Design a protein around this ligand. Structure first.
Ligand SMILES: CCc1oc2cccc(I)c2c1C(=O)c1cc(I)c(O)c(I)c1
Ligand SMILES: CCc1oc2cccc(I)c2c1C(=O)c1cc(I)c(O)c(I)c1
Lengths: 115, 115, 115, 115
C-alpha cells in the first residue's frame, strides 16, 4: 500500500467514518484525471487506492468530501471539501500516509512519508 | 475588507512573508475563473483582494503557493499549495478571514466569519 | 505589549470570547508562581497581561481554561485546559503572541515571536 | 492498551522517534503524581503505559519532552514541552489515543476515544 488516507473528527474525538474521497493525477494538459476513490472505514482509514506499479511520480490531488460528512452529522461546515495536492517523488522506497483532522471551520493535514 | 488571508510559519515562529496566492470563483459553466491575487505583507496578511460589491455569492477557492515559499527557505516541502474552497455570502454578506499555518509536511487552515 | 494571547473557536468559526487564562512563572525554588491573568475580549484577544519591565527572562506557563469555555456552549470537551510552556526573553526582550485554536477533542497552539 | 500516545514530526513528515514522555495523575492534594513513562518507538508510538485495572477515572497529564527532540535535530524550539491534560471518564468501554503533531514553534494535539 503506497498511499493511505486517514481522517479524524475533532468534534467527536473519533475516526471520521464513511468519508468519501477522490484522488486525481495531473495530466500534461494541466487537467485532473480521476485516479482512485473510496470511503473511509470504521477506523477512518482508506487503503488499497493504488499499487506501487501504478503510483508513478507526478502531482496528485486528494479531494475529501468533508461537506457531506458534516451535513450527515447535522453540522454546518465552512469548506466545500478538503484538498491535498502534492508531488510524489522517487527517493528510495517510500509509502505515503495523508492524514486530515476535521473541524467544521478548520482542518489540518499532514503527510507521513516512510520507507 | 470582506476577504483577508493571514499566513504564519510554524518553523520560524513568524508571519509568512511574500507568500503568493490566487483566488478563483466558480463560473456558471463550472470552471474556475480568476478572481483576485496578491502576496502577503511583512505581517503575513493580504488585504484588499476584493470589495463588498464585487464579492457576490459563489464558490471561491484560495490557492496559497506554499511550495515557492518553502523553496526560497531551502526546504523541499510536501504540498504543491494549500487550497481553501468555500461557499461565500450564501446568507447575505459576510467578512471572511482565511488563516493558514505552514510547516514543510503539514498545514492547518481555519476561517473566521463575521457578520 | 510583550505578551498577547489570541484564541479561536474551530466549531463556530469565530473568536473564542470570555476564555479565562492564568500565566505563571517558574520561581527559583522550581515552583509555579502566579504572574498574570485575564480573559479574552470579543475579538478573542487578551492584551495587557504584563509590561516590558516586569516580563523578565524566565520559564512561563499560559494555562487556557478551555474546559469552562466548552461547557458554557453545552459541549463536554476532552481537555481540562490548554497549557503553553516556554522560555521567554533568553536572548533579550521579545514580543510574544500565543495563539490557540480550539475544538472539543483537539487544539493547536503556535507562537509568533518578534524582535 | 487503554492509553496510547502517537507523535509525528511536521518538519520531516515522519514519526517522531525516541521522544520521552511522562504521565502523571492528579492527587487529592492537587499535586502531580508520576504514573507512567516511556519513549516513542520507530513508529512514533508509545504503548503499554498502563492497564485497564490501573487506569481509573481522574485527571491525567502527559508531558512530552519536545524540547529535547528538537535539540537533538539541531533545531531551536519554542516550547519547553507539550502538555496534554484531560479527564478520563467511564462511559462504556473506552480506549484513548493521544496524538501530537510537532513543529518547532507550534504543536497540535487530538484525542481519539474509541470503544
Ligand atoms: C495564519 C494564522 C493562523 O493560522 C492558523 C491555522 C490553524 C491554527 C492557528 I492557532 C492558526 C493561526 C494563528 O495562529 C493565528 C491566527 C490569526 I486570525 C492571527 O491573527 C494570529 I497573530 C495567529
Ligand atoms: C501524532 C499523530 C497526529 O497528531 C495530529 C495532530 C493534529 C493533526 C493531525 I492530521 C495529527 C496527527 C496525524 O497526522 C495522525 C494521527 C493519527 I491518531 C494517525 O494514526 C496518523 I498515521 C496520523
Amino acid at each position: 500500500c503506497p498511499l493511505m488516507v486517514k481522517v479524524l473528527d475533532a468534534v467527536r474525538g473519533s475516526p471520521a467514518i464513511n468519508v468519501a474521497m477522490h484522488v486525481f493525477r495531473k495530466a500534461a494538459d494541466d487537467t485532473w484525471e480521476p485516479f482512485a476513490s473510496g470511503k473511509t472505514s470504521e477506523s477512518g482509514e482508506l487503503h488499497g487506492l493504488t499499487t506501487e506499479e501504478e503510483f508513478v511520480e507526478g502531482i496528485y490531488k486528494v479531494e475529501i468530501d468533508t461537506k457531506s460528512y458534516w451535513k450527515a452529522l447535522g453540522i454546518s461546515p465552512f469548506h466545500e471539501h478538503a484538498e491535498v495536492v502534492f508531488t510524489a517523488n522517487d527517493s528510495g522506497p517510500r509509502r505515503y500516509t495523508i492524514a486530515a483532522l476535521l473541524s467544521p471551520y478548520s482542518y489540518s493535514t499532514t503527510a507521513v512519508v516512510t520507507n
